[PDB]
Amino acid sequence: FTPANRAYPYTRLRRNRRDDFSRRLVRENVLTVDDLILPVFVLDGVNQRESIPSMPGVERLSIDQLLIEAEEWVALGIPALALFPVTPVEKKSLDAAEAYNPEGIAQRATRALRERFPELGIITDVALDPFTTHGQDGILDDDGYVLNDVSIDVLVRQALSHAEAGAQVVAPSDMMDGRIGAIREALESAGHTNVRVMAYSAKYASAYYGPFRDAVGSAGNKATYQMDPANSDEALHEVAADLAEGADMVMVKPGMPYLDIVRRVKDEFRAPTFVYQVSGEYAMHMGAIQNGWLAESVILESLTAFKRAGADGILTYFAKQAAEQLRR
Amino acid sequence: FTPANRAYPYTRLRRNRRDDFSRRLVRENVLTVDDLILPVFVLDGVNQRESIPSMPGVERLSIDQLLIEAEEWVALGIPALALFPVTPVEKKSLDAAEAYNPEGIAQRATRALRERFPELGIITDVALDPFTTHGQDGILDDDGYVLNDVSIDVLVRQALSHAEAGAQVVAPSDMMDGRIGAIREALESAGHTNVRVMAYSAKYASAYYGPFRDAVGSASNLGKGNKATYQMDPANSDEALHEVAADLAEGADMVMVKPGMPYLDIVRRVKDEFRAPTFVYQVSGEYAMHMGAIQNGWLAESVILESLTAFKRAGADGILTYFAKQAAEQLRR
Amino acid sequence: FTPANRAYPYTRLRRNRRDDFSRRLVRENVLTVDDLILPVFVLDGVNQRESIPSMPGVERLSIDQLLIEAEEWVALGIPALALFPVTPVEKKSLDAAEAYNPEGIAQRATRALRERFPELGIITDVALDPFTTHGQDGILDDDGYVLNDVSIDVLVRQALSHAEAGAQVVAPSDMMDGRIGAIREALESAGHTNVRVMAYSAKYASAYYGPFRDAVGSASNLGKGNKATYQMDPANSDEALHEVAADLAEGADMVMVKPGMPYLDIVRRVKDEFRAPTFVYQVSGEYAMHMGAIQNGWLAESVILESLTAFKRAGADGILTYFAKQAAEQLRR
Amino acid sequence: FTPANRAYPYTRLRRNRRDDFSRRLVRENVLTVDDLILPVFVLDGVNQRESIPSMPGVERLSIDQLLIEAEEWVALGIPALALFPVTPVEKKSLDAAEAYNPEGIAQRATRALRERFPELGIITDVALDPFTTHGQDGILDDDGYVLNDVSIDVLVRQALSHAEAGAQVVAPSDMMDGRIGAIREALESAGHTNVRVMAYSAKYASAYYGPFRDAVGSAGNKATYQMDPANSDEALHEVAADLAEGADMVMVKPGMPYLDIVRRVKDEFRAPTFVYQVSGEYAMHMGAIQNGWLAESVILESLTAFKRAGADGILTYFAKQAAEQLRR
Amino acid sequence: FTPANRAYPYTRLRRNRRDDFSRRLVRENVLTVDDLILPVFVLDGVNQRESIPSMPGVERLSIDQLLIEAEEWVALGIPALALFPVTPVEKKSLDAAEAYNPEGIAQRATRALRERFPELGIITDVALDPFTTHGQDGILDDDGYVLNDVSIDVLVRQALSHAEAGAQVVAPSDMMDGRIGAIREALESAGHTNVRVMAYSAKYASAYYGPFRDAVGSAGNKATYQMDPANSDEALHEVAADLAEGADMVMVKPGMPYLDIVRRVKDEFRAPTFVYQVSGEYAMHMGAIQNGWLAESVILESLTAFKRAGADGILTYFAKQAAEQLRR
Amino acid sequence: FTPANRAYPYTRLRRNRRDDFSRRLVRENVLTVDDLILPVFVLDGVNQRESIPSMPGVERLSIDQLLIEAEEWVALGIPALALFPVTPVEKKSLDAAEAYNPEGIAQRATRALRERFPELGIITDVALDPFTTHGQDGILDDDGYVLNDVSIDVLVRQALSHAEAGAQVVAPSDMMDGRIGAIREALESAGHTNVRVMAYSAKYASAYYGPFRDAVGSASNLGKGNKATYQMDPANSDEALHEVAADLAEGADMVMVKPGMPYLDIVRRVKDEFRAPTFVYQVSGEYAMHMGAIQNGWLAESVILESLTAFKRAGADGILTYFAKQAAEQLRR
Ligand SMILES: [Mg+2]
Ligand SMILES: [Mg+2]
Ligand SMILES: [Mg+2]
Ligand SMILES: [Mg+2]
Ligand SMILES: [Mg+2]
Ligand SMILES: [Mg+2]
Ligand code: NA
Ligand code: NA
Ligand code: NA
Ligand code: NA
Ligand code: NA
Ligand code: NA
């Protein structure tokens, strides 16, 4: 950055703001549907939907209903979904074995979508917290500590089962050290050459996940694996490791409360960069809009921010709404 | 940056996360009371206190009530207030003359606070939008365009009236080009040598100001109006650096990014490039959306300190936040 | 940049290439209609439409015809036009006086378009080469040298005549030293506060302008002449940064690189160093060579959007292109 | 970059432009014959030349004719040729075995040139598309996907056969991940210590290759291996990998529509950098010149651009024309 | 850094200094108790304390006394202690075997503190100089040279014994090349996954250690392993190696005479950065304060410097004093 | 920086440490006599020599005694002295007039040294704190605030009196904003073309000056007073870069950081960013704490050259140090 000695009144930054045509020409960033990933909550049943108290307007969907809705998502141009199964309580355990069940919700939903919409991206969730009895993120030792390498063993089995289901992207959200490299090695050994790994690289120990926990039925803290909200430099180490270990894309989470992190990650690594606008961000915005406190326009404003900050792709519960505005 | 060939399992970033003592040691940033500015809505009259439905837990206060509340803001260590007068309807006009009235609410409130709390920082708002019938931040030409240099003449008179009232900091929030330099030159000429200028440098044409406009009562004046010919396009990041560079050249003592959390990347760029005192406004819409979620039971109250910690990590030195009292209470404990 | 120790087979860059959905997600740049400026050749007279053999598919149009065509340019969302008058032979002279004629073609066309399409951006050409008997961009001394400061006096009058006609943007294409500052000061003094200056900052002494010179009819005036004493040596890259820095200092609102695809590295440097609104001219020779190849069947029509995507990737915000209509049609579909 | 407060009228950038002598002194870049590589299309026969419809003035040449022409190329000072065989249809197959035939056109032309002009550089094309029945870039799986590692196996055999023919440079144009490292390992194992590898590192999925496809007789898309024209950051990852894998020089392709990529690659890596002015660029220019729409001078202008952008060497169908102008 | 053309009188840097409230708002750095590590000297006995002539106000403490004092340290919020045993003369040897004695002072103190204050960080000293007869830093060859790899063998045994005692951090202060990597490998092999390594990375051959040598009873030079005070660039190589070898935090030593090194290390690596305000710095300051030559306020001034220079954590004999001022 | 993949055991950084000859070869920095400035305390009167209990081994000297001592400072090669007069009590006043007295101690001492040792560099102190009854560095307003521009008027007269006395270097230590430019303009206008200005650029509101204030006898004048409204907050690092940039713009020939060893990171930043002659003051408190420890037997005398080597490594070109004679003696041997 060079200021180039620009000075009022020779330089008046309002001249370009004067007319819509000059604002449109110089406009630095834009949201398009190419940027959008829709996370979806998937039920076990058939002919079912459920409303979520802390996520107004978001539904859990059984797989038949998910296929119906996906027709419109595909028509809108949304490139990918991110699947989050809502695991029945009977299928939760200490060993999280349901993670790699070829008939688990994630695996069944994946096969169904891959067959019905071959061009639609399916990003599965590599994670043990949907399958543990404690909603905790992995296998626990006697002190209640989430064991790093032993949990990865389970995540690796899960990632393989997602690849076999035909998922084009697996996205480890677990924050175990080294899991990206372990999952990549396994995929490569098993001949899953082209399965992308979307690392949750810099995923903070946040209070903004509350409504997601209600959505998935897992509703303890995670400061021993998820990042301290205070730390920024530390995020660069996380991403560097994950790129070395073979991630095809890297993600910051949560989103708008961490835009500075998005900016640094894109600037320093110049790699495909993703950001999750999490359940709490969605719920904050949607709550204020429904209360009449904010205009609908905040939705696009929030999504434009992610582009401006350097994100290539955004995981957002507003993906459908945003895509419909962009179609119009 | 230099990754230094750090590789798992030799590098395991969970080791520092293992225990509280090590997380505390390596913790890169923290919010303190020194970082906090409380914006306050100020009524005319006496013994007036009004709730704001779009800003739950926030009240408009007459000056007598403001003086009483400020006792505990001072006790909690909050360094400064940012005053926002709620202009009576009959005092709005084309020429925004009420802006420089020595007896306007902002001027009166300043004089009262400077006397009662001589150590408390008073930031006044340099801006015509509270005083105009149309709700725009300056004087309109015959095409309804906000005139730049003519509006600055009025902002200059206003800033001078604020200095004369004893304000330590004037904050032009108007987004006219050149106004920081015009205000600085007027202050210097008049002998207001040490009056700080906190420039709203990169203030975006945002939708997150809705509840503030309700609170000061400019919402009905503005109607469906927009500020796209002066406040910045949300899409633009490089442009913000040009804004800040000019305001520093023009003599700003502090530079501000607004809104806040939707623009953390801009805070990061501004601090990184200029290394200057950097400020950020956690706007009314940001406050309301958090409040709304907390009151519904959708988010824990811990999101308040998480939202504020973000501004520190992004590179802000000071934060204008309606949560300043809550936060200062939480830090005192 | 930081390679982050990425190594095959852990890193396989074909994974993101595997499917359309992943290519779309990671796709770093895209052309939109917001990026497009259509240059247009404007005839005197009424009901005139002339093909240009060296620019297949491009026509010179009288103002009545321009107004009709512009209806669909507006409907397709093209933000702005760049006007290039085709000066009658008898109006060319040593003093280039026709440049500032309130009744010249450019002035007339501007008034007509500003009235009929108030939202359409009109970029006028500040330049003496359409009005000079020799075809050079300024007034010659007795050695046949293009005088710098004397030519600026004329360009200043011209820019003022354009502003008076209602042009939102004047674009000095002349490559005189200092002209951006001289034009800016004249606009400011005259109250043309918001008239943008789109500086042709790094315009090269190129051979790719041949078909344009046919189109405006300056080719016969120029003959074998060259512009080496003002337009930049093609070999020089560092020099372009000094050009842009001066034009920004002098008050340009936008800076332009010209020609385009033969100078993509200069676009990249200019955007990287200055972070300012950056423009690029896909010149007449670039248009013709693509057209020629497409019409012969040697290249698919897909090269059009590939050539334009390149400007975005290189760092241009806006592109002056004779393909603007074709491209906007292709994007609408 | 420091502007150093330079200001009109103290600074007038036209002063150096005033006279030829000052323009020549400050002139930042120049094309010389040292920068030129001539690609040539090689026929199977004897005493044969063929004209190419979409490449005016370019001939396919049998090997006897190629030796005749190379005398003038050598006299002009052109450092290297890039050989592109025109494979007879009978010698195309699914397995691309003709790639490593010691009596293939490329191998025969290489031996002949190495013997007759020992100082002339010969850059062979490591590629399966001249030898496949589908002109596709490698071995196909059941879905028609170009298999990465299995194709490399064939490319490695081909590169070895080029080294044995005496090629000083092999230039893999295939865009398989990891092929540079695989080819380098093989060359090193086989004792081909000094055989240079000119990686096609950042080679875009372009429409500018049309006339080349007519030239080689292969006249389907390549977006699953060649780069998206939209992507610039991604090019830096490609080059970094190829330098780590052992490339001696790295190339951007196509050329003038990707000068920004040349600039970034030279700036970031400071390694020997090449650029291909492809058949479509040649044909666009030559078409406009022949139509009288552009002056001949555009040829040198286009080649000067490559130098200015940071290229060390340029693969160009204009190499002979440019060399003759530089001789005069 | 961009000056942004700031000029007197438009810019008056005294405006922000005018009032306490504006100084507090712009204040760039602050010391908190989160930053503080207290080094402590530990005696063999019971019911014992000893004063140290060259460290006014610092005591050696037997383990019972150490537990008593640690109550107040914990109440103050001090995150960690750094243990330095005062080894009885009978337990010194050429082989330094007392380093890895499970009943050595360090190991006994560690167990006791880990049991009584489970949240208090214990950083042990990985070092042979407390256990050698010559106070020299390792195993000596026939010339009196400190043997690199042979000393590491002993340090590795010692670090393992500290991990088994329950130390959360081991801090190798020895300056043997490669010891960080050797100690990390051993910890990982032995299943000590979460034991942090605080490398003394850039530890100068300083005269500021004198009073420490009196404190530990070891009271020869160290220029063959500790760094030349003259060298700054060399410090970056030391830290890069130690980060590659697996250190979780990196330290500069001594402190205030090396603030430029702190600044460079934080700027270049963006990793958790520590600094030791050594015994000589403590004694210089405390001496001047007691003589009435300097005000008590120099203590916080010196500690604020470390934060400003880029240190995250500070090893300081003033930790208690500083924490009490911060509590008030 | 570039680690270049250096890894143990191929890289063993102890190899260069193995022998003295290799340590000497790679040794990155060294102190020499060329780097040394000796500050001296100067009494009125004749045949006066006074010890300073808070600065062991340092004496206040009358001018006759200063002239004698300076013979060996010159012989040891010390390039320059920094004079600090010890102002008689009766010469302190509100207006600090003694600052510009042609017969003041500093002026007299300068004339005497310039005559006796024409090659010895004389740095005079531009500052009002030795001459004010309150001990502050400028003139107070009615609120007890140190007035900026009014104090500069006095500093300007003083700097001129120093130049007239023959001082080659004036060093404003006052921390008024703008004083470097004001002093430079006055020197230029008056024909003092080559008088250097050594700016105390980033001088902190420090506690390490205590023994100096005893030595010049301003300690009793200052009492409990502070200089927080002008000298820099110790916590601030970015701010120091803004300070230095202004002083260079204003015409400083050298820029100084003060205090020294507690601010080595600031020395490093200032040298790195500006590449300008950089100076650092090893203050009286730094001298005393080292002295105290050496005399008690707690630290070896080798810490003296270690403290000074640090300033070189950090990027200082010159060091103001009460150890200059000891150090120059140690280097001569
Ligand atoms: Mg990780
Ligand atoms: Mg502005
Ligand atoms: Mg120019
Ligand atoms: Mg590749
Ligand atoms: Mg080491
Ligand atoms: Mg200053
Ligand atoms: Na995208
Ligand atoms: Na702050
Ligand atoms: Na654009
Ligand atoms: Na070359
Ligand atoms: Na810390
Ligand atoms: Na020096």
Curated annotation (Swiss-Prot), chains A, D, E:
Binding site for 5-aminolevulinate 2: S279, Y317
Catalytic activities: 2 5-aminolevulinate = porphobilinogen + 2 H2O + H(+)
Co-factor(s): Mg(2+)
One GO term of the biological process aspect: protoporphyrinogen IX biosynthetic process
InterPro entries in the cross-refs: ALAD, ALAD_AS, Aldolase_TIM
Keywords: Heme biosynthesis, Lyase, Magnesium, Metal-binding, Porphyrin biosynthesis
Active site feature: K203 (schiff-base intermediate with substrate), K253 (schiff-base intermediate with substrate)
Metabolic or biological pathway, per its Swiss-Prot or TrEMBL entry: Porphyrin-containing compound metabolism; protoporphyrin-IX biosynthesis; coproporphyrinogen-III from 5-aminolevulinate: step 1/4
Domain of life: Bacteria
EC number(s) stated in the UniProt entry for this protein: 4.2.1.24
Cellular component aspect of the GO annotation: cytosol
Residues binding 5-aminolevulinate 1: R213, K222
Binding site for Mg(2+): E238
Role this protein plays: Catalyzes an early step in the biosynthesis of tetrapyrroles. Binds two molecules of 5-aminolevulinate per subunit, each at a distinct site, and catalyzes their condensation to form porphobilinogen.
Protein name: Delta-aminolevulinic acid dehydratase
